[PDB]
């Protein structure tokens, strides 16, 4: 201990063992001061945003979050390659964090010139909420992770929460915590925080894609001694009715008895990028899918895991079907499609229905020539089926991960759910890695020699810089395949650029050229 | 130990055991230096009032004091409710004092620029008055608590105390007390105090109502077997003197003959919130009840557990009968009714009398129609009982506690005292949880180079910051009734509001929407 001695090393590095490949990273992290040491609360009226889909009510918090919860926080695109490209499958297994060589920095302000010095005796705050007793805000996609780049000095999001709102106002049941009110570990400089975690018994992640079809699962050179309805008429005429069968078999596939379907579907809105080819309209919101809840709307986004696009038709996407990235440097808003990069999920489409699409169609009448109730003769009409939930004998897959992306989300505690996998990808888990919570100990500037009662708004400005170190052991599913084919790998290209792919360019930006899934192997169904 | 390692935790939460809840809170502290480390003396002239009631005569102290006698410095919201409405009783058990992470930090006015640095070599002394030979100041309901909220920073209020006055003027027994002649801890930022303290016995504070009243404690369908007087005569003339009696029963529950009696009653004048029901003169303090000591007059404020009104008269309260809350940013003086919440003690209706009302009346003569010493005929004639002290087969409650009320007080030392329960409501104790004194250490700015014999009035400028923890378990009196009717319970309202109740607001301020009593539970008489 002490100020002299660090108390802990960087250790950035990863180890592929038999079937498991454990991940280590360090970073360098800044944390601010937040709210002034205050727990304002929040409204749309606090930011004077009006709609009701958008209204919220919550509290703001002094505390920042650790956010690791995306995979190129502890892949290399080189690691993420060697894992993708030999693995049907991975799940984590046990999560490490560390915390070490802190430093508390006193910043001053004199005549406008910027002096900081380092406070060798203010702590910094920190707690695991491994009772999982507060508003988990990982799982939500955010902007403030461990940053992919080693090399890249990051801050720490400010924490806070939403609560139940009755438009901008709070209701009774709206939940306030105090983060305070939990047992928190103090440091200055000499101490460091070590947290172990076992994740919990998740399934692989499906690192394939299938090289069969849901519908082409047969035998194609024999018979199926199963009948099926070919002919209702005899050709021309009137009063020419008949009921003729013929075998199914390999030259009518489609009328083939089979065992299983293709998973749930819930229709988006099909967006071309060849922009000619949309309509002249605005319908990014109106004309897309969307769920409501207590009289608000949400869009579905990303929703079920459905194939993008059908074969053939790759300038296609769902409007909010599909994960969408920045690429680097992209700005906030109206960036143009260049500027992002969509993801497709085209590798499902062997077992998952195309997300465009209406999964068929349903019969909605009784066909008939006449009856004694009505003499209206009425053929075979048709509905298509835009939404279908689970059915037994339903089979489909999740949707991908990617480097980008992220890893792990935690399942709301309800009374049901199903199939509990995050709709945006990763391992759904009751007990995820808990949320690690980070303050400066506030440091009163200097209180008036005669007393006063209030609560003593005049701080010291300071901030906090350390390291942080994560480790993650991953357990591997060994590619197995009887395939004499060779096999679709993720590769980079030998074709001379500027730049190297997933480098930094001479303005020593880091950025990542694509999104890269883990579905490249092969398996049958 | 050092200055690069804490030397405690942040730990404020609250466990609930079988009978026992303990509570732990952490709150940072900032301590200034006060009096400029001087023992001024006090007086009324001193600040220049002139009141013989308000004469006084004391010592103020460069130190200061910590104090956590407030029940919501140890209890959430939601743990008093969690307290109030499943449990009859709660005492406290032992306590439990930490302070640690302490930093004194000097301040230097270079041109009128304020410049924070710390000394990592200055002490700050802290002792516990354990042989309670210092005034006990504590138990004045004084505004310099530990905050509700576990996110604010406290300023340290300023110890001093009283002895005996002559007006302005001390007398031969007052006493002059240097704290400095107590031996004190010395802290320089590595170290830490630790003190413990058990509760002496206590009994169990009553957290409950009556669902039963004193003058309705019979059998309503079975006659008493006792014979009251009814009638004196019979009816209208002259000379009908009769002496009829008849049985005590349910058609006359006003005659019938009691075991137990009301508690004492000392009158107070009632005031009601619609002002235009209010006399159009100033009686607050001309027509406030009081009591006198050597000559002058304090307000009795609040005086004997009395109820605050009778059934049916909210509107009325006590002059000062009842504790009177600050809302929220409430000023000091002549603020308005709305700023300020009067507690009302109605739930001991049942058994206490009502405090603006003049506990029954006595017989003030001997009737008559004619003796040999005079032929003056005397009809009863009665007076009106405005204070009763205490009488053999008398039943009373105590005061309520609140969230926002003290804990304990320190009983007098004296050689009689009766039923010495606090009469602002809490624990009454011989040896309270003693007094913790908190002091910088005078640091002197620099001597002169030839020696002087003066006592160096040159310091330098400095204050202390630091964590203070206090832990308390409480026993509890679980609920064992077995009434069928469901209870009422203290709860929050389901009504869309601005802010959550017991929450902070947009500012950041946290405030306590009503005052919260402990009596919510039922038991019978």
Not at 265 to 288: D, I, K, L, M
Not at 338 to 355: F, G, H, L, R, S
Request: one cysteine or more; charged letters at 15%; aromatic letters at 12%.
């Amino acid at each position: 201990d002490g100020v002299g001695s660090s108390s802990g090393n960087w250790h950035c590095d990863s180890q592929w063992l038999g079937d498991r490949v454990i991940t280590t990273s360090t970073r360098t992290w800044a944390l601010p001061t937040y709210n002034n040491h205050l727990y304002k609360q929040i409204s749309n009226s606090t930011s004077g945003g009006s709609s009701n889909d958008n209204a919220y009510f919550g509290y703001s918090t002094p505390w920042g979050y650790f956010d690791f919860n995306r995979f190129h926080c502890h892949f290399s695109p080189r690691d993420w390659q060697r894992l993708i490209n030999n693995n049907w499958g991975f799940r984590p297994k046990r999560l490490n964090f560390k915390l070490f060589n802190i430093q508390v920095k006193e910043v001053t302000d004199n005549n406008g010139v910027k002096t900081i010095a380092n406070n060798l005796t203010s702590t910094v705050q920190v707690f695991t909420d491994s009772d999982y007793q507060l508003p988990y805000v990982l799982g939500s996609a955010h902007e403030g992770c461990l940053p992919p780049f080693p090399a890249d000095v990051f801050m720490i999001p400010q924490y806070g929460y939403l609560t139940l709102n009755d438009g901008s106002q709070a209701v009774g049941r709206s939940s306030f915590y105090c983060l305070e009110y939990f047992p928190s570990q103090m440091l200055r400089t000499g101490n460091n925080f070590q947290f172990s975690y076992e994740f919990e018994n998740v399934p692989f992640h499906s690192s394939y894609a299938h090289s069969q079809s849901l519908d082409r699962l047969m035998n194609p050179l024999i018979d199926q001694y199963l009948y099926y309805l070919s002919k209702t008429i005899n050709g021309s005429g009137q009063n020419q009715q008949t009921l003729k069968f013929s075998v199914a078999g390999p030259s009518n596939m489609a009328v083939q008895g089979r065992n299983y379907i293709p998973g749930p579907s819930y229709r988006q809105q099909r967006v071309s990028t060849t922009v000619t080819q949309n309509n002249n309209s605005e319908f990014a919101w109106p004309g897309a899918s969307s769920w409501a809840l207590n009289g608000r709307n949400s869009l579905m986004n990303p929703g079920p895991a459905m194939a993008s696009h059908k074969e053939g038709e790759d300038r296609f996407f769902p409007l909010s079907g599909s994960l969408i990235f920045g690429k680097q440097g992209t700005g906030r808003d109206n960036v143009d499609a260049d500027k992002v990069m969509i993801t497709n999920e085209e590798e499902i489409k062997t077992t998952n229905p195309v997300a465009t699409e209406s999964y068929g169609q349903v019969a909605t009448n009784h066909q008939s020539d006449g009856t004694l109730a009505v003499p209206f003769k009425a053929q075979a009409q048709t509905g298509w089926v835009q939404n279908q939930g689970i059915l037994p004998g339903m089979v489909w897959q999740d949707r991908d991960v990617y480097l980008q992306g992220p890893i792990w989300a935690k399942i709301p505690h309800t009374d049901g759910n199903f199939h509990p996998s995050p709709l945006m990808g990763g391992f759904g888990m009751k007990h995820p890695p808990p949320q690690i919570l980070i303050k400066n100990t506030p440091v009163p500037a200097d209180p008036p020699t005669a007393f006063n009662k209030d609560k003593l708004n005049s701080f010291i400005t300071q901030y906090s810089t350390g390291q942080v170190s994560v480790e993650i052991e991953w357990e591997l599913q060994k590619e197995n395949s009887k395939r004499w084919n060779p096999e679709i790998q993720y590769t980079s290209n030998y074709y001379k650029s500027n730049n190297v792919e997933f480098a930094v360019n001479t303005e020593g930006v880091y950025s990542e050229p694509r999104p890269i899934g883990t579905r490249y192997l092969t398996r049958n169904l």
